[PDB]
Amino acid sequence: MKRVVITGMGGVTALGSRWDEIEAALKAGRNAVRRMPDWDYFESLHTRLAAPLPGFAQPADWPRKKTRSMGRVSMYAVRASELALADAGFAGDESISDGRMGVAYGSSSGSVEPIRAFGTMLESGSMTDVTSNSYVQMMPHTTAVNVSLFWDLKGRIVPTSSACASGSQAIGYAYENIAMGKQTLMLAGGAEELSGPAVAVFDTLYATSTRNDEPHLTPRPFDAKRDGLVVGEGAATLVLEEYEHAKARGATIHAEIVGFGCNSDGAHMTQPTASTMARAMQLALEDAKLDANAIAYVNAHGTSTDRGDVAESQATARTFGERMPISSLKSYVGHTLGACGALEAWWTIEMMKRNWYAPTLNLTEVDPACAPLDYIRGEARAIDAEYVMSNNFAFGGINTSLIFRRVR
Amino acid sequence: SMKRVVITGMGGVTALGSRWDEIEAALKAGRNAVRRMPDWDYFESLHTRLAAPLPGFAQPADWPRKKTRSMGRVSMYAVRASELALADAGFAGDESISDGRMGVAYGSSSGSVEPIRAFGTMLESGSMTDVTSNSYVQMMPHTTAVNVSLFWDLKGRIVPTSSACASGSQAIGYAYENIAMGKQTLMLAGGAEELSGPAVAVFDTLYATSTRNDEPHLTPRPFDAKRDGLVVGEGAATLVLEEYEHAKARGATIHAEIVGFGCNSDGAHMTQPTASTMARAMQLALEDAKLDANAIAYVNAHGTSTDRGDVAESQATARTFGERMPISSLKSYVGHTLGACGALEAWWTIEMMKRNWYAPTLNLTEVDPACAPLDYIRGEARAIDAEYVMSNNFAFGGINTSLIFRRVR
Ligand SMILES: [Ca+2]
């Protein structure tokens, strides 16, 4: 079995793309949530909150032949992957397209334009905006394919479109593909584009925060006064690479991936089950041949929903006890959906490298319904980790747990 | 210490029926399942009026409402397929499969029509009349995988393989590797699709659809000189994959063993296929099975009946095996069943292998000279006694899959 390391990280997020910009934003303690007055267009959305990207600069040199197939979510994915490849030292590399780099990627949904066009085709038969490019922009695997095609990659495409589990399954399944010798390298990530329908998914479940006048004060993971999540967007990509290969070219190695656990609650489509969530974490620990005691920090899923936070806290307390430091980056960028597992893995590794762990924003009173954990808040925590864990729990009760090993 | 993997359950919902005996009779009777689709006059700009629909489908009566709310048709097909495959594997009424030992790999090209309409219209006009709390789960990329997994309360890993045409074959392949690698003892693996106007527009807008609107019995025509495109079909198919000792220990009837899986992409074009990388996918499978090309007695083509698809596939196959290789396309009967195609074709290929009986490509009367010489079975079924068979599929984005199944005599 091959060992697997991370030699590239990048993305487009509500806090920026470079880590130094993101660190400053984390450190400044304001979230990226805003009012969305344009959503008055939609008939029946309660929430008027989101955490959009502060625009998105499509690079000038991108060729039409390639961009015709991309809506925003695929553009995000590609841009993320471009940044990660540069960071990994592969800018202009001629060899990565030879069939031994593959792509694992997904999103909750394709792009708005073709969803509108195909939906209207059903509604009225009209095909005005249905084109030969509509499917590839809508398709479940739009992100994975667009990323792969963009660098003329010829490896396997692993299409991990599993709503919020998209990015963490990408990482995990890419990791297993390298470990078992199918691919030498993998681009692995997740992405999402913000839209009204993307928000309606959670708003119709009453899972969304409706504090429409106080965007700076919501969401509030594990807080007693939380009232739901806030939807965000963007993408993040990790370059995973077989260990000897990385060593042989003298790559700067950000982390090693040592465990991945994945299961399902098999119970509720939305209402999470703590025991099976805990079991995902155990599976990861078993895969890493580690005791729970080895983990210095957990990066929560931490959506700020009522049941989600309770069930996650119990799952975590069950695996680790009350001593575990934990925080939720969704307090800053919201629930970035398809992107969340990749963005959170990335930032969790950045924090691990620097012995600096961001607090959960807007957590002032720990909800007594949540299990006692070491909820970092108020100020960042200095920890010197050998191992960290990042968890995600998704629609359909799909659970993932990733364990990263420190590399000095 | 890799685990061997066998197939102990097969089933599905298809234009030719569900039971193999029923399907065999249809294959033998040599009529395709293609029909004129007058309803598509509703759509503004479709050239084709052909499809291969299911002749009907009704939910089993004993499916409980609480479990079916989250299903549109494609997920209903997927669940029914998987239900048949589970019975066939001996797991009906057996709840131990829910204990985390069994997982699910599944996908489709698309979610269901209703919520696509509802969300699309929300974008079009802001109206949310028909957007409900159940719309996303019926529309979502992984609707099939999640609905199947939830239906039996399964607690294993979900491997979403929604990759258009490659959905069913990637499901089988990646489920196979999960069992081989020891992550799961069992997996449901399959693919599904529901017929819709939009599903046909995907290919119609590429001019890849047949437009012989008055001659449904005569089209599609894989590898034929007179072919003019594909015909879109629908349905689902599920295989129960199972670790070998586990199967042996409970005395399971074993249909076949999966011995190789190759998966790559062309990295060239979104729709136009590249022969060399298609061949390489076949090689990857052969290498995974530690077999020489010589070992393969038959190839189940993808055989979509498109102009470039059939040429590229033929060359790729000739390049790997030489002119001697027997090959045929089940899409000549049921059309291109999209999400379902890799699973349905895998299933039927194993059924044919078990019986030494290989269906010809329907409506293949003059082999296109632009296609590479292969042993194109046609006119009558061929008797072959195979120790190994291969089933190939090539999809949107240049995604290629090759599966190798070993005879279990
Ligand atoms: Ca290399």
Query: Which two tokens mark B267?
Result: 């990295």
Distance separating alpha carbons of residues A121 and A135, to the nearest angstrom: 13
CA B327 to chain centre: 17
Find, among B8, B2, B184, the residue nearest to B100 by Cα: B184
Instruction: Enter the DSSP assignment of A232.
Output: B
Determine, for residues B270 and A149 on separate chains, whether the beta-carbon distance falls below 8 Å. yes
Tokens coding B198 = 């939009």
Q: Is A370 annotated as catalytic? A: no
What span, in angstroms and rounded, lies between the C-alpha atoms of B67 and B154? 13
Taking the centre of ligand 1 as the mean of its atom positions, its distance from the CA of residue A157, in whole angstroms, is: 19
Out of A254, A262, A301, A340, the active site residue is: A301
Q: Computed from CA positions of residues B212, B214, B218, B219, in that sequence, does the dihedral angle turn out positive or negative?
A: positive
CB distance A330 to A219 below 8 Å? yes
Catalytic (active site) residue B269: no
| Ligand 1 centroid, distance to A20 Cα (angstroms) | 30
The tally of CA atoms less than 13 A away on the side-chain side of residue B233 is 32
User: Strand A297-299 relative to strand A325-327: parallel, antiparallel, unpaired?
Assistant: parallel
Q: How far is CA A176 from CA A171, A181, B160, B194, in A?
A: 9, 8, 15, 32
Residues 188..247 of A with a Cβ closer than 8 Å to B: which?
Answer: 195-197, 200-201, 204-205
Q: By what technique were these coordinates determined? A: X-ray
CB within 8 Å of B396: residues ≥ 6 apart: A135, A136, A139, A145, B163, B164, B165, B166, B270, B271
- Tell whether residue A245 is among the known ligand binding residues: yes
CA distance A211 to B357: 66
Cβ distance of B128 and A157 shorter than 8 Å:
no
Alpha-carbon distance A333 to nearest alpha carbon in chain B (angstroms): 23
Please classify residue A308 by burial: count the beta carbons closer than 10 Å to its beta carbon, then call 0-12 exposed, 13-18 middle and 19+ buried. Answer: buried
Tokens of B41: 């006059």
Q: Do A139 and B164 touch (CB under 8 A)?
A: yes
- Give the Cα separation of B138 and A269 in Å (integer): 11
| DSSP assignment of A281-305 | HHHHHHHTT--GGG--EEE------
Q: At what angle do helices A112-124 and B197-204 cross, to 10 degrees?
A: 120
The verdict on a CB contact (< 8 Å) between A123 and B124 is yes
Pair A384, A292: CB distance under 8 Å? no
Task: Say which residue the tokens 């993040």 belong to.
Answer: A236
Distance between CA atoms of B397 and B326, rounded to whole angstroms?
27
Instruction: Give the mutation candidate from A123, A126, A260 for the B interface (greatest B CB count, under 10 A).
Output: A123
Q: Give the chain B residue nearest A198 (alpha carbons).
A: B136
The Cα A110–Cα B125 span in angstroms is 19
Spelled out in words, what is the top-level CATH class assigned to the domain A260-408? alpha beta
Active-site hit among A141, A254, A262, A335: A335
Determine, for residues A149 and B267 on separate chains, whether the beta-carbon distance falls below 8 Å.
Answer: yes
Ligand 1 centroid distance, CA of B97 (Å): 42
Indicate the domain borders of chain B: 6-260, 261-409
Answer for the pair A94, B275: CB distance below 8 angstroms, yes or no. Answer: no
Nearest residue on chain B to A275, alpha-carbon basis: B155
Out of A43, A141, A180, closest to residue B128 by CB: A43
Q: How far is the CA of A154 from the centre of ligand 1 (A)?
A: 14
CATH of domain B6-260: 3.40.47.10
How many Cα neighbours within 13 Å face the side chain of B188? Answer: 43
Residue B327 pairs with which residues in a beta bridge?
B299, B376
CB contact (8 A) between residue B43 and residue A265? no
Q: For domain B261-409, which architecture applies?
A: 3-Layer(aba) Sandwich (3.40)
Respond yes or no on whether the N-terminal peptide bond of residue A219 is cis (omega within 30° of 0): yes
A326 in reach of chain B (CB within 8 A): no
Q: Return the SS3 of A89.
A: coil
Among residues A72, A66, A149, A139, which one has the least CA distance to residue A106? A139
Residues of A in contact with B129 (CB under 8 A): 43
List beta partners, residue B88.
Answer: none
Helix residue ranges per DSSP H, B227-330: 244-249, 275-288, 307-321
Binding residues of B for Ca(2+): 246
Write out chain B residues lying below 8 Å of A395, CB-based.
Answer: 136-137, 140, 146
Q: Quick one: tokens of A270?
A: 């939305």
Alpha-helical regions (H) of A132-273: 134-138, 142-150, 166-179, 196-203, 243-248
Q: Would the CB atoms of A263 and B155 count as touching at under 8 Å?
A: yes
Distance CA A406, CA A392 (A): 20
**CATH superfamily entry for domain A5-259:** Thiolase/Chalcone synthase (3.40.47.10)
Strand partners, A343: none
Would you tell me how many other CB atoms lie within 10 Å of the CB of residue B139? 26
Cα dihedral value B146, B151, B156, B162, nearest 10: -30
DSSP structure class, residue B100: T
Q: Which two tokens stand for residue B151?
A: 């239906």
Q: Does A94 touch chain B (CB under 8 A)?
A: no
* Closest in A112, A157, A266 to B153, CB measured: A266
CB contact under 8 A, B121 and A121: no
Q: Please name the residues in contact with A193: beta carbons below 8 A apart, sequence gap of 6 or more.
A: A71, A72, A73, A76, A107, A109, A111, A112, A233
* A46 in active site: no
Q: What angle do CA A239, A242, A244 make, to 5 degrees?
A: 130
